[PDB]
Nucleic acid binder design. Sequence first.
DNA 1: CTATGTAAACAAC
DNA 2: GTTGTTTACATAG
Length: 97
Amino acid sequence: MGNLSYADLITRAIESSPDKRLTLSQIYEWMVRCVPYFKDKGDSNSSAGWKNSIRHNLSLHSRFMRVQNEGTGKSSWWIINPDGGKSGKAPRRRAVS
DNA sequence: CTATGTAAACAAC
DNA sequence: GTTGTTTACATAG
């Protein structure tokens, strides 16, 4: 990573799409195909944990929310939320076990 | 303390 | 296995 974060990158892939929504697979594709850094799924396929990491960021903060299709199958798109308003602390971890 | 990055133990598939 | 969460620890600043 030259300058940016996983958090940001994801929010970025999801930013420039024909229509706003992406999917892990699709997100994963962005990563592997853009910015020399990731190489995993490209022509060949899969290196370790970044796979697991991206899932973390997405599910964790406040810019990403998930949307499925009510129907029989798997349309889970990752979109962005709350832009007009800003404020809202995110329980920044450690109370405890 | 805070944000980032990881590694991994898991509820549903 | 895949997707989604959520503990937990590691730093760097």
